[PDB]
Structure 1
Amino acid sequence: CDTVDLGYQCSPATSHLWGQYSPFFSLEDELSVSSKLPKDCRITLVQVLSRHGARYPTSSKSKKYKKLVTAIQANATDFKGKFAFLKTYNYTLGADDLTPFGEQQLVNSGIKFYQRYKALARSVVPFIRASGSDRVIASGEKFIEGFQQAKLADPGATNRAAPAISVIIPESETFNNTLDHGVCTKFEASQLGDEVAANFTALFAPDIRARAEKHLPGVTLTDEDVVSLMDMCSFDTVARTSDASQLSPFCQLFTHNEWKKYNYLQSLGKYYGYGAGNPLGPAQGIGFTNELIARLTRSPVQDHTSTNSTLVSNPATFPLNATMYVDFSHDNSMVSIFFALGLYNGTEPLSRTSVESAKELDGYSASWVVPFGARAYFETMQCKSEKEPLVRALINDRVVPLHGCDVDKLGRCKLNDFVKGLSWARSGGNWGECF
């Protein structure tokens, strides 16, 4: 179902509408131009930013799902219509760990990274960092596995040493980690994304709750139960087979229009939790943004947010000359980073109460931006055409037109204008409000 080049295309009317629980699917050419390498240009540097793949529910959530499925089964006198599978369903999901399907998504990602940048990757060993989370590090290892599988099959590859994960960045309230958030005190106390997501759930779920209970005489459901049954559709699909070849029976319980609501619920939680809807959301992406400026311009980092000044000034942990960089982060920090880079500056603040599509929001949704296995590529290229370098940004293969600089028809800016137009992050935005 899952392809190396295009990601997951099984039951796309449903599987592309699970927000950050959607398996990655390519958005090449959706509301965008081709992602192909322009004629007469050569990539000179690529940064990849990736999430982990599909996983089991967290321990917390696995207990809540198992307690709900168990309670329905305990209490119902009849399992009616599309809910009748619950008669025999056995809750079998594990917790926390990547699923086999999620591991393969990351092997695929590495193969796809090699194939897309083959002319560069042939002679280069990427510099790789991972935020210190087992799922993230495991994803980094699978991406390396796929990259090497591809490289050692290419007779034009000249430097075939495998890359190591060189930097594991601790995750805590006191470690400055640009790939995870933790040190911005006031932001860690924020409840806004939760409050927005709960308000929206309380608006859309009641009608589904009422219809669902009536298919299960003896059962009482809540709004949160609706959300848990919808969550079950993605989690059971990405666990129940090693290739996610079978849509879970939970999925049919809900209509296509209801799936659009659930997708929106996830987009709202990310937008108001971590993106521009949170007053300190984009501030969590300034540290990586300044790290990216340093790499693209081969110049030392200027940052006073969540960089570590020690780690950024040593070539062992932050080389400025490496041609390929790959960093493994998290969905929530990746949303902050994309906002901090200005990439969704055509997105108006999302309606807290009513569905707006990814295309209405100029390419923003949780499923188009941080699906399981999400990746972004930030390229510099040197053209026979042009001659300052040019920069381009791809998020899950969609060319996302840059803001803060005048973009050409291929969505590129001159590198110097790009970095100058990142004035908000270069200034440290409103980081001082953290304290």
Structure 2
Amino acid sequence: CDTVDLGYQCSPATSHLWGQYSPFFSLEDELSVSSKLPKDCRITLVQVLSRHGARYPTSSKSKKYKKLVTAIQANATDFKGKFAFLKTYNYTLGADDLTPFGEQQLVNSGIKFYQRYKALARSVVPFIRASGSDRVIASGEKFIEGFQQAKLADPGATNRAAPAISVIIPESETFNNTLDHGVCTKFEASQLGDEVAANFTALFAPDIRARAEKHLPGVTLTDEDVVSLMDMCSFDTVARTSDASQLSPFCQLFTHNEWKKYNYLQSLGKYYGYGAGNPLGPAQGIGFTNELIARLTRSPVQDHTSTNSTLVSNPATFPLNATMYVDFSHDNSMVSIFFALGLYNGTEPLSRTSVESAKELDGYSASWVVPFGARAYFETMQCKSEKEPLVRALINDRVVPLHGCDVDKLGRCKLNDFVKGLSWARSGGNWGECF
């Protein structure tokens, strides 16, 4: 179901509609020109920003799901139609960690990165950081395994030293971490994302609730419970087999149209929680944006948001000339970073009452942007066509045309023009509003 090149391709009428719980699926050529290296161009730098792989529910969500399944089994006097499996379903999902399928997604991502950037990767040991979450570190380790596997199979590789994770950045309300939000006090108190999500859930869940209760006489559900049952479709799928090759029985409880609504609920939560829908959402991505500027320009970091001055000032923890960089992070920070970079500046604020497709949203959705195992590549290339280095952004293989600069038909801008266009991040944006 899942391959190095194309990601997850089984049951796409369901599995591509789980938002940030969808396994990565390649968006090569989807509302986009090819991501192939253009003729007479050579990559000179690449930054990768990768999410962790498919995981179990968080400890708190796992407790909530198990509670619900138990109550359904305690209360139902019959389990009708496609709900029949719920009589004997045994809840055994873990918590927080990667699933085996999620580990393999990250091995695959490391193979794909090597293959795509083979010309550089043959001689380069990437500089790697990970946010301090066990699933994120484990994802970095699995990516490195895949990178090394591919490099070992290439008789043209000259430097095969294994890359280490050189920096693990703590996750704390008081540690400035560009790969995980947490220090912006006002933002952390925001309820906007949850409120938008709750409002949209109240629109679509009642009809599903009524149908589920009809097939489970004796059971009383809430709107929240409907969402839990829908969450279980993704979590059970990515856990129950090593290769996620069998759709969970939870999945067919809901129709394709209902999956489109769930997919949009996820997009809304991310847009209003972490993206431009939140007044301090894109501010969470300023620190990484300034780190990326420093790497692209081979210059010291200029930032007073969520960079750590000690870490960015030491070449051991922040080299300015490493040619390949790979950072491991989470969905929410990645959303903020993509918005801070201006990559979704063609997306209109999402309707809170109506489902809008990724097409109508200029390529934005949670499943297109931050699926499990999501990756972004930020390239600098030197092309015969142009004296100045050109920048290109690929999000899950889709070319995402740059905003703020004189962009070409291939989605690229000249390096200096691109950096000039990031004036908002370069100034620190509205970070002061945090406090």
TM-score range, shorter chain: over 0.9
1:262 CA displacement: 0.4
1:173 CA displacement: 1.1
1:362 CA displacement: 0.4
- Is 83-92 or 102-111 further displaced after alignment? 83-92
1:91 CA displacement: 0.9
Aligned residue number for residue 405 of structure 1: 405
1:222 CA displacement: 0.8
SS where residue 231 of structure 2 aligns? helix
Structure 2: distance between partners of 1:207 and 1:13: 21
1:10 CA displacement: 0.5
1:309 CA displacement: 1.2
SS where residue 403 of structure 1 aligns? coil
* Per-residue deviation, residues 156-197 of structure 1 (Å, max 9, x unmatched): 000000000000111111111111111111001111101110
1:332 CA displacement: 0.3
1:372 CA displacement: 0.3
1:14 CA displacement: 0.4
* Per-residue deviation, residues 27-53 of structure 1 (Å, max 9, x unmatched): 111111000000100000000000100
1:204 CA displacement: 1.0
SS where residue 411 of structure 1 aligns? coil
SS where residue 394 of structure 2 aligns? strand
Structure 1: distance between partners of 2:367 and 2:81: 29
Structure 2: distance between partners of 1:158 and 1:287: 34
1:250 CA displacement: 0.4
Structure 2: distance between partners of 1:382 and 1:409: 17
* Per-residue deviation, residues 3-35 of structure 1 (Å, max 9, x unmatched): 000100010110000000000000111111000
Aligned residue number for residue 428 of structure 2: 428
Structure 2: distance between partners of 1:341 and 1:95: 33
1:385 CA displacement: 1.8
Structure 2: distance between partners of 1:83 and 1:127: 49
Structure 2: distance between partners of 1:340 and 1:300: 19
* Per-residue deviation, residues 359-406 of structure 1 (Å, max 9, x unmatched): 110000000000000000000000122121000000000000000001
Structure 1: distance between partners of 2:303 and 2:59: 36
1:124 CA displacement: 0.2
SS where residue 92 of structure 1 aligns? coil
Structure 1: distance between partners of 2:133 and 2:96: 11
1:151 CA displacement: 0.2
* Per-residue deviation, residues 250-303 of structure 1 (Å, max 9, x unmatched): 000101010001000010111011000000000000000000001011111111
Structure 1: distance between partners of 2:174 and 2:217: 51
* Per-residue deviation, residues 330-374 of structure 1 (Å, max 9, x unmatched): 110000000000000000001112111111100000000000000
1:314 CA displacement: 1.2
1:218 CA displacement: 0.9
1:84 CA displacement: 0.7
1:72 CA displacement: 1.0
What TM-score do you get using the length of structure 1 for normalisation? 0.99
- Is 337-346 or 348-357 further displaced after alignment? 348-357
Aligned residue number for residue 76 of structure 1: 76
* Per-residue deviation, residues 81-110 of structure 1 (Å, max 9, x unmatched): 111111211111111110000000000000
Q: What percent identity do the matched residue pairs reach?
A: 100
Aligned residue number for residue 390 of structure 1: 390
1:316 CA displacement: 0.3
Structure 2: distance between partners of 1:431 and 1:158: 44
Following TM superposition, the consecutive aligned residue runs of length 4 or more in structure 1 with deviations greater than 6 angstroms are: none
Aligned residue number for residue 336 of structure 2: 336
1:63 CA displacement: 1.0
SS where residue 259 of structure 1 aligns? helix
* Per-residue deviation, residues 108-158 of structure 1 (Å, max 9, x unmatched): 000000000001100100000001111100000000000000001100000
* Per-residue deviation, residues 220-257 of structure 1 (Å, max 9, x unmatched): 11101100000000000000000000000100010101
* Pairing 1:140-159 to 2, within 5 Å after superposition: 140-159=140-159
RMSD between aligned alpha carbons? 0.6
1:203 CA displacement: 1.1
Structure 2: distance between partners of 1:309 and 1:230: 43
SS where residue 325 of structure 2 aligns? strand
Structure 2: distance between partners of 1:76 and 1:168: 47
Structure 1: distance between partners of 2:421 and 2:385: 23
SS where residue 167 of structure 1 aligns? strand
SS where residue 262 of structure 1 aligns? helix
Aligned residue number for residue 7 of structure 2: 7
1:75 CA displacement: 1.1
- Structure 1's unaligned 5+ residue stretches are none
* Pairing 1:128-147 to 2, within 5 Å after superposition: 128-147=128-147
2:419 counterpart of 1:419:
yes
SS where residue 328 of structure 1 aligns? strand
Structure 2: distance between partners of 1:42 and 1:92: 49
Structure 2: distance between partners of 1:271 and 1:336: 9
Structure 1: distance between partners of 2:389 and 2:105: 32
SS where residue 363 of structure 2 aligns? coil
1:219 CA displacement: 0.8
1:71 CA displacement: 1.1
Structure 1: distance between partners of 2:252 and 2:338: 33
1:313 CA displacement: 1.3
SS where residue 55 of structure 2 aligns? coil
What TM-score do you get using the length of structure 2 for normalisation? 0.99
SS where residue 272 of structure 1 aligns? helix
